[PDB]
Amino acid sequence: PTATWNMVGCDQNGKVSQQISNTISFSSTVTAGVAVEVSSTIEKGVIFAKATVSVKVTASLSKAWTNSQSGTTAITYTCDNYDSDEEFTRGCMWQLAIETTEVKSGDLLVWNPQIVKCTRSNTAPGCAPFTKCANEDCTFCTDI
Amino acid sequence: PTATWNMVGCDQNGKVSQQISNTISFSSTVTAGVAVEVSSTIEKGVIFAKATVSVKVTASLSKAWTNSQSGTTAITYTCDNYDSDEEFTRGCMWQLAIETTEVKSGDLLVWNPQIVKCTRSNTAPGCAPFTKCANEDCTFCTDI
Ligand SMILES: [Ca+2]
Ligand SMILES: [Ca+2]
Q: Do A42 and B51 touch (CB under 8 A)?
A: yes
Q: How far is A109 from chain B (nearest CA, A)?
A: 10
Of the candidates B93, B83, B134, B89, which has an alpha carbon nearest to the alpha carbon of residue B114? Answer: B93
CA pair distance B93, A79, nearest whole angstrom: 19
**Nearest CA of chain A to the CA of B2: how many Å?**
16
Closest alpha carbon to B14 in B91, B124, B81, B94: B91
| A91, containing H or E segment | strand A91-96
The residues facing B57 across adjacent strands are A36
DSSP A49: -
Q: Are B126 and B76 in contact (CB under 8 A)?
A: no
Assign residue B55 the CATH number of its domain: 3.30.1750.10
Please judge whether B56 and A33 are an interchain contact, meaning their C-beta atoms are less than 8 angstroms apart: no
Q: How far is CA B72 from the centre of its chain?
A: 10
Say yes or no for a CB contact (<8 Å) between A91 and B130: yes
Cα–Cα dist B115/B117, whole Å: 7
Nearest chain B Cα to A33, which residue?
Answer: B60
Kindly determine whether residue A22 and residue B69, on different chains, have CB atoms separated by under 8 Å: yes
Experimental technique used? X-ray
Resolution (A): 2.9
CA gap B54, A126 in Å, rounded? 79
Beta bridge partners of B54: A39, B41
Spatial CB neighbours of B99, under 8 Å, sequence gap ≥ 6: none
Cβ contact (<8 Å) for B69 and A8? Answer: no
Neighbours of A39 (CB within 10 A): 16
Q: Which domain holds residue B11?
A: 1-144
- Specify the amino acid at residue B70: S
Q: How far is CA A39 from the centre of its chain?
A: 51
Dihedral (CA of B101, B103, B106, B109) sign: negative
Nearest CA in chain B to A88: B80
Give which of B136, B138, B120 is closest to B128, Cα–Cα: B138
**CB distance A37 to B39 below 8 Å:** yes
Ligand at minimal distance from the CA of A86 is 1
Chain A residues with beta carbon closer than 8 angstroms to that of B77: 9, 11, 14-16
Quote the number of domains for chain B: 1
d(CA A133, CA A139): 7
Task: Write the burial class of residue B75 (CB in 10 Å: 0-12 exposed, 13-18 middle, 19+ buried).
Answer: buried
User: Smallest Cβ distance to B60: which of A17, A23, A33?
Assistant: A33
Report the C-alpha gap between A118 and A91 in whole angstroms.
8
Distance of CA B39 to CAs A57, B43, B53, Å?
A: 14, 14, 11
CA distance B40 to chain A (A): 10
